[PDB]
Amino acid sequence: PHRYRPGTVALREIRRYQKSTELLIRKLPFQRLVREIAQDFKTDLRFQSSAVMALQEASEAYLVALFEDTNLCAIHAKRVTIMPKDIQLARRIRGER
Amino acid sequence: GVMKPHRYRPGTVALREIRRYQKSTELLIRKLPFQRLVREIAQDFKTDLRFQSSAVMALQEASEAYLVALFEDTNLCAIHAKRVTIMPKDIQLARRIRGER
Amino acid sequence: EPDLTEEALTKFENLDDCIYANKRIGTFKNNDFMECDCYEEFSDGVNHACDEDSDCINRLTLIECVNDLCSSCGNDCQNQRFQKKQYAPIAIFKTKHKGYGVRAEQDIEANQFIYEYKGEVIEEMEFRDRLIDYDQRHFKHFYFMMLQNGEFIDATIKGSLARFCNHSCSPNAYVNKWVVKDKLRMGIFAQRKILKGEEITFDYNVDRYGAQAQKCYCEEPNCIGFLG
Amino acid sequence: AKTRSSRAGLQFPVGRVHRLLRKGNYAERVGAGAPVYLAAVLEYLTAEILELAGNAARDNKKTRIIPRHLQLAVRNDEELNKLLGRVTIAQGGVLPNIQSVLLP
Amino acid sequence: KAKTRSSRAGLQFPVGRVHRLLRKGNYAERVGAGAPVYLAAVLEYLTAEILELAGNAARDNKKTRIIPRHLQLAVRNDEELNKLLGRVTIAQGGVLPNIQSVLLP
Amino acid sequence: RKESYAIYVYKVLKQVHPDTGISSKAMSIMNSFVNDVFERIAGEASRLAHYNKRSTITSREIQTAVRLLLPGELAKHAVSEGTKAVTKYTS
Amino acid sequence: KTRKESYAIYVYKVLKQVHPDTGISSKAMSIMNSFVNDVFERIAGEASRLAHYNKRSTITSREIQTAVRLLLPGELAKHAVSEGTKAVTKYTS
Amino acid sequence: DNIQGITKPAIRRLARRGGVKRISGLIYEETRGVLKVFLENVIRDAVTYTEHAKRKTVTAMDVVYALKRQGRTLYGFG
Amino acid sequence: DNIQGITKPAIRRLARRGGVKRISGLIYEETRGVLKVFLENVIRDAVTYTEHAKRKTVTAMDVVYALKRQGRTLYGFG
DNA sequence: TCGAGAATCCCGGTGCCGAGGCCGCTCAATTGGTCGTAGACAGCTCTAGCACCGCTTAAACGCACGTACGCGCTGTCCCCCGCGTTTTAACCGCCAAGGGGATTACTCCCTAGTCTCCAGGCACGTGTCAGATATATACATCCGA
DNA sequence: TCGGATGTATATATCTGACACGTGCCTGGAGACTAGGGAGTAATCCCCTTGGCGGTTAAAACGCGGGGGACAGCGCGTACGTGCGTTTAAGCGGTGCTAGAGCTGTCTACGACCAATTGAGCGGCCTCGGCACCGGGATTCTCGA
Ligand SMILES: C[S@@+](CC[C@H](N)C(=O)[O-])C[C@H]1O[C@@H](n2cnc3c(N)ncnc32)[C@H](O)[C@@H]1O
Ligand SMILES: [Zn+2]
Ligand SMILES: [Zn+2]
Ligand SMILES: [Zn+2]
């Protein structure tokens, strides 16, 4: 009957994934997603091994840079929980949609 | 005496001015204090300069659009904060999300 | 009895259009006709475009809608309550000690137009002489109204039916201002649901400076005793 | 002496565009169909901008195109607002809009 | 003998390669003589300025080789290098450790 | 002398809307627009010609620059009008 | 096959001069090469724009100095201009 | 249907790297939509460069040029 | 003190153009600071172009080129 | 105000693969000389920029008044987090076919450069209708006497 | 009733206004001709891409208790709205002077260009050391008492 208060494991994961630098999205589902949404532009394509890695690094950096501003919007709204209106605000101030 | 029954509620004249300055397209800052400000901040970079008129007009037309876009994004921040009044923390949030600071 | 209305039509001079002592009078200083944004037009039946519980920016900004200038809206609107003179049934009845107070005829709901205050428009340099001769001729009441910082509204000789209403410290009516083709016109709405047989009163907030301090006969538990 | 623009069937000039491609130091060699193609693209874009500006001018009963009409014609289209995203047009103003949480 | 312009100007980055890239980059018709020397000096100063902070981070994290994590830390811990490389994603670098003050108890 | 595009915008305007005019400030805005779009397409075509180790800007390079710079619906009509103009010129 | 030119050995010499005992991997060297190429293209494009605006044909050291002054922020631009001026002065005499 | 391959514990790890303490339940579909739009734009530009190059293999340099047009400037790949 | 020339009913007028209904009292000094930082960042590049062009007058094309470097293309002065 | 319990770092042994050094080989940087033209400098013109001054009047400021909303506080309920169990496909290792990217050689035809001819757009004067403006007299419209 | 002063405004005849048309011209665009070098095309080689299959387990999926934060409502009071008189300096004309932008000539020096040379830098092949990985013990933070 040993349990932690909710938040401690969350801060531990924040420290762990801000210390470690590695891939977070798995390689084969991301590669299948890239190939599936690449079938809509040209049939019978061919991909290298490093292009998928470059796409995954760019997507990871874009998503982390989005969630940082989203968390800042959630803090400015006097909340801790992130709602998708914070995502919409962070993408609308930046100039995307 | 003269009875005085009328007084405008706060908000009606404000929305009327919003419609007025969203319909009209003109200069909103006075020209000579803006020119004195530009010359004073340009004295610190190079002594004994000289300006045209179209350069100062280009500076003013840039500053107008910059400040109007800043107040639009700041009003969006204040609406997201479940308020109507704009605070300077909304300005700081807009400048930090935009990438200026 | 409604015969007092027919007597009052013989007392003063009733009018239907606004008159002025000068053509250049103090009006709204920015004339470019801010129009609305509603595109609805029910021209076959009844125009339900500019009505309450809607998004009419001219109604929310207190701006009259003009027929031959407001495009993409229609030809007739329910916001047009001054040019069409969509008035209320009125009956001038007697009071105890106030005089001839206007008492309501039927049930008037909240935020509903009753009758437009009309009359002459006078200049302050002429208003000084009007105050002097109306004071020395010893008239029983005063029938004036503030329009701007230097322009007043007279309704003694040439007035309307809204010049009779008395003062009370627990009112059921309020007065707004409207811009009707570069004209500042008055108007009396309703605060609450006015029932049958109730005298329609409103706050004067008069700032008098003469040699007479009148009294009030409202006798409600919110009064003071003086007039401003 | 037929002009090259009359041979191409366009209204924008072609030899001026070829001279600007040879002058601006973009490459060592310039082809023959590139100024015709680029003049056609510029003519189509200019015709689209002037068509929407004429529509915005007829929407206010005017006989002359003003930068306010240019601002409205750019900002009321989806693709032209994406093309001219961070471009400021002088004496143009902004689009009239009022938020829904501000109305009483 | 036959000296080089890099040894003549006292620099470590090459001068003939930069001059060839200026002549073949389609920037102008004519290229001066002091411009590749000046640009090689600027590039050498920027390379030394970033490798100083990279080596300081590698010494402070008790390592020897410089990895993209140390490059990311050396760029993002400086002010003017972060202002210069503001729209640059460095691969295998990660982010800075930063927890907001309203989240931790 | 001073080169501009002030008469060609007149020629396009008299074909798209005959009963109208245009001022001088709007003409300056249109000239700045034509110059900006010209410089962006020329720079994109120069980079596309440099990336393939070639020294010649062709209609294929300009078409690739148009498809990279303009959005979805507008670039298709631009490619169609440009291909029609090249076909009429080579016919 | 085909010779591939890179800035690896020169950044390695700068690293061995600025630190006596410090190594570097291949990925960090690729990032350094891409950084040198990016700053080279930025300064060369800005100098080309400066030479085109003034109706010139020759890119001298003045256009490179003005491009460095426009592109590098604050204190770094002053030291870059000083080191480049020292290098041009040493190359002249 | 490979957009569901971006699992729930992966967006959670991306948020923990971003610094998020608590995540709601409507974040994941919006995150998948944003990722889909961004990847469609970058893959559209990369396939445009590949079709211009008259090839069939999408190299890493096409991806670097597609990110350079967007303003990303990825270092480390060519 | 020419920064006080940006008066109180001018920032309010800019906010009324921007669609602002109600304004606090700590907005004006922040707006003056933002305008001063932006104008210094543009005037520095304009004076740099003027010093490079061997002139002593700051023309409009230098301002247009500075705004082009800032990422804000201005039409109507070229 | 603290002891079980779970992470977390220090230290030591194993080990393995990749940064660095060495050597051979093409090739582009270097040096020398010739030659074509880019702009450095001096000079002349003339034009907007700066400075000053008088007049008018529209915008800013200080103060009075008030009322509407920002924020502190309390309840509540619901939904996301920590933990345990079950499933499942990702990572790795391995082999096999093959298809297109890079290279080399050959051939061709497209465009830069040159010369001559000529006509088209840029200034430079004229002409507009929209928007007003100097006499003046009918049509009323009042102000003494 | 009689004498005297006045707003409106079209008949007649005039003063800006920013754009919309007849000519002079000269400088840039168009028509042949030649040479050569960039570009198109066929063949070859291999090496990187794609596809299949088996074993293992880290990680994804699924329930379940609960507790802490998002959301709804109430009350306080202050601070930012509207208005009025006062003050202040922003427009708006007119004149004067001049530093400095803009346009021409001379020709000196600085970079383009080609041939020979050789030291400089890219590529293949060891090699030993620094960081990857695992086991044991001491250290540090958590949470119900
Ligand atoms: C309805 S009108 C005149 C009333 C009545 N018809 C008369 O002839 O006296 C408004 C006037 O009534 C007067 N009045 C208003 N409230 C009053 C009151 N409570 N008691 C007595 N007179 C009042 C005001 O002075 C105002 O001038
Ligand atoms: Zn309406
Ligand atoms: Zn209406
Ligand atoms: Zn009373």
User: Among candidates E12, E41, A48, E63, which has minimal Cα distance to G28?
Assistant: E63
Nucleotide nearest to G58 (CA to C1'): J38
Helix E68-76 to helix G26-53 angle (10° resolution) is 40
G35 near H CB under 8 A? yes
D100 near I CB under 8 A? no
Which positions on chain J have an atom < 7 Å from some protein CB?
A: 5-8, 18-20, 28-31, 38-39, 48-50, 59-61, 66, 68-71, 79-83, 89-91, 100-103, 110-112, 118-123
DSSP F49: H
Q: Strand F56-57 vs strand H22-23: parallel, antiparallel, or unpaired?
A: unpaired
**CA B45, CA B38: separation in Å to the nearest integer?**
11
Give chain E as a 3 state SS string: CCCCHHHHHCCCCCCHHHHHHHHHCCCCCEECCCHHHHHHHHHHHHHHHHHHHHHHHHHHCCCCEECHHHHHHHHHCCHHHHHHCCCCEECCCCCCCCCCCCCCC
Cβ neighbours of residue A8 closer than 8 Å, sequence gap 6 or more: none
Q: Residue holding tokens 């914070």? A: A86
Query: What are I73's strand-pairing partners?
Result: D87
CA–chain centroid gap for B42, Å, is 22
DSSP A43: S
**CA G69, CA C69: separation in Å to the nearest integer?**
58
I77 near D CB under 8 A? yes
**Atom 4 in ligand 1: residue holding the nearest Cα:** C99
Rg (chain H; Cα; Å): 16
Half-sphere exposure of B61 (CA within 13 A, CB side): 25
Cβ neighbours of residue G4 closer than 8 Å, sequence gap 6 or more: none
Task: Please answer whether residues B92 and A89 qualify as being in contact, where contact means their C-beta atoms are separated by less than 8 angstroms.
Answer: no
CA distances from C111 to C52, C54, E9, G20 (A): 10, 14, 87, 86
CB atoms within 10 A of CB A57: 23
Under an 8 A CB cutoff, do H72 and E89 touch?
Answer: yes
**CA C150, CA C62: separation in Å to the nearest integer?**
22
> What are the phi and psi torsion angles at C214 (to 5°)?
-75, 170
Judged by phi (left if over 0) then psi (alpha if -120 to 50, else beta), residue C187 lies in left
Does residue G20 lie within 7 Å of nucleic acid chain J, judged by its CB?
Answer: no
C102: three-class secondary structure by DSSP:
strand
Q: Which residues does a 6 A CB cutoff place in the pocket of ligand 1?
A: C 98-101, 140-142, 164-167, 214, 216-218
B/e letters for A19-34, b = 16+ CB within 10 Å, e = fewer, are eebeebbeeebbbebb
Task: Please answer whether residues H75 and G34 qualify as being in contact, where contact means their C-beta atoms are separated by less than 8 angstroms.
Answer: yes
**CA F37, CA B31: separation in Å to the nearest integer?**
32
C104: three-class secondary structure by DSSP:
strand
User: Among candidates G20, B46, H70, which has minimal Cα distance to A61?
Assistant: H70
Query: What are I74's strand-pairing partners?
Result: D88
Determine the distance in angstroms separating the CA of F37 from the nearest CA of chain I, rounded to an integer.
12
H or E segment to which residue C92 belongs? strand C90-92
**CA H72, CA C19: separation in Å to the nearest integer?**
70
Greatest C-alpha distance within chain C: 60
**CA I39, CA I32: separation in Å to the nearest integer?**
10
**CA F36, CA I74: separation in Å to the nearest integer?**
10
CB atoms within 10 A of CB I69: 16
Q: Which two tokens stand for residue E102?
A: 């309203």
H or E segment to which residue G52 belongs? helix G26-53
B/e letters for I22-53, b = 16+ CB within 10 Å, e = fewer, are ebeeebbebbbebbeebbeebbbbbbbbbebb
CA angle B74, B80, B86 (to 5 degrees): 40
**CA C132, CA F37: separation in Å to the nearest integer?**
75
Instruction: Set out the domains of chain A in order of their start, with CATH numbers.
Output: 8-94 (1.10.20.10)
Report long-range pairs for I51-54 (Cβ below 8 Å, ≥24 apart). Answer: I51/B46, I52/G50, I52/G54, I52/G62, I52/G63, I52/G66, I53/G53, I53/G54
**CA C21, CA F81: separation in Å to the nearest integer?**
67
Point out the residue among H17, H21, H76 whose CB comes nearest to the CB of E68.
H76
In whole angstroms, K92 C1' to B34 CA is 19
Chain F's closest residue to H42, CA to CA, is F68
User: Among candidates F50, A50, F59, which has minimal Cα distance to H46?
Assistant: A50
Determine the distance in angstroms separating the CA of E7 from the nearest CA of chain G, rounded to an integer.
9
Cβ neighbours of residue C124 closer than 8 Å, sequence gap 6 or more: C150, C151, C152
Task: Please answer whether residues H60 and H53 qualify as being in contact, where contact means their C-beta atoms are separated by less than 8 angstroms.
Answer: no
Q: Which two tokens stand for residue I23?
A: 């304004």
I77 near F CB under 8 A? yes
Helix A49-76 to helix B54-80 angle (10° resolution) is 70
What is the second-level CATH architecture of the domain H3-70?
Orthogonal Bundle (1.10)
What is the second-level CATH architecture of the domain G7-92?
Orthogonal Bundle (1.10)
D104: three-class secondary structure by DSSP:
coil
Q: Which CATH class is domain I8-70?
A: mainly alpha
Query: What are E89's strand-pairing partners?
Result: H74
Give chain I as a 3 state SS string: CHHHHCCHHHHHHHHHHHCCCEECCCHHHHHHHHHHHHHHHHHHHHHHHHHHCCCCEECHHHHHHHHHHCCCEEECCC
A50: three-class secondary structure by DSSP:
helix
Q: Which CATH class is domain F6-90?
A: mainly alpha
Cβ neighbours of residue C180 closer than 8 Å, sequence gap 6 or more: C64, C82, C83
Give chain H as a 3 state SS string: CCHHHCCHHHHHHHHHHHCCCEECCCHHHHHHHHHHHHHHHHHHHHHHHHHHCCCCEECHHHHHHHHHHHCCCEECCC
Cβ neighbours of residue D24 closer than 8 Å, sequence gap 6 or more: F42, G52
User: Among candidates G9, A66, F50, which has minimal Cα distance to B97?
Assistant: A66
**CA B88, CA B95: separation in Å to the nearest integer?**
11
**CA C116, CA C119: separation in Å to the nearest integer?**
10
CA–chain centroid gap for G68, Å, is 9
Task: Please answer whether residues G67 and G77 qualify as being in contact, where contact means their C-beta atoms are separated by less than 8 angstroms.
Answer: no
Task: Please answer whether residues D26 and F42 qualify as being in contact, where contact means their C-beta atoms are separated by less than 8 angstroms.
Answer: yes
**CA D80, CA D45: separation in Å to the nearest integer?**
10
Q: Which two tokens stand for residue E92?
A: 């295998």
User: Among candidates A43, A70, A37, which has minimal Cα distance to A55?
Assistant: A37
CA distances from C81 to C57, C189, E25, F85 (A): 16, 12, 74, 60
CA distances from I53 to B55, E98, G51 (A): 16, 45, 10
Mutation for B interface: A75, A76, A87, A96, most B CBs within 10 A = A76
